[PDB]
Design a binder for this molecule. Sequence first.
Ligand SMILES: CC(=O)CC[C@H]1C(=O)N[C@@H](C(C)C)C(=O)N[C@@H](Cc2cccc(O)c2)C(=O)N2CCC[C@H](N2)C(=O)O[C@H](/C(C)=C/CO)C/C=C/C=C/[C@H](O)[C@H](C)[C@H]1O
Length: 165
Amino acid sequence: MVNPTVFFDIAVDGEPLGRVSFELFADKVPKTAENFRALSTGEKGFGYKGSCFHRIIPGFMCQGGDFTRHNGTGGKSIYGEKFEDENFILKHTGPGILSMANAGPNTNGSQFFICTAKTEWLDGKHVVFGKVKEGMNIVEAMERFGSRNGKTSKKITIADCGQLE
Ligand SMILES: CC(=O)CC[C@H]1C(=O)N[C@@H](C(C)C)C(=O)N[C@@H](Cc2cccc(O)c2)C(=O)N2CCC[C@H](N2)C(=O)O[C@H](/C(C)=C/CO)C/C=C/C=C/[C@H](O)[C@H](C)[C@H]1O
């Protein structure tokens, strides 16, 4: 069937910025895609709603997804604290690529990053599972608030999120 579409409504210090939409590559990485989908709807009782982007590096990536500790060290998946690296079929081929952050092999949780460039050296190191479908302009706007070391000058939060059909 068709790949799912989820969206994030982004805010800056509580003020709405816009919506970014993503396609999840469920035909390639079903387990990884399903985790992100369910975390976006909130249907298992926990998820990205209300969490923030803790590390933003202009020209490289925007990372978020820690809804358990809210400091960059937490997050969990719908299957448990960690799940395996499903495969490394997809590559970090350009801006808008959605990939899973990790702390070593087979430690996928909820943290993810959005690529704002093609970065070959990431390949084989992270599982790619989607891409920005619409709202790339919104991702660019979020970048204005990051810095070389990743610390944001303003709170960038996911004010709301879900699935679109
Ligand atoms: C439980 C605990 O305390 C662990 C904290 C530790 C960590 O493992 N954080 C994890 C999260 C997911 C739990 C984490 O986040 N992993 C990074 C690891 C990484 C670092 C550098 C390159 C890389 O490919 C992977 C992760 O998956 N991402 C996604 C891709 C970009 C990368 N973070 C990143 O931010 O790269 C920066 C980069 C390459 C900038 C280039 O300009 C350099 C930052 C390093 C941070 C190190 C932390 O002390 C360590 C991750 C800690 O959080």
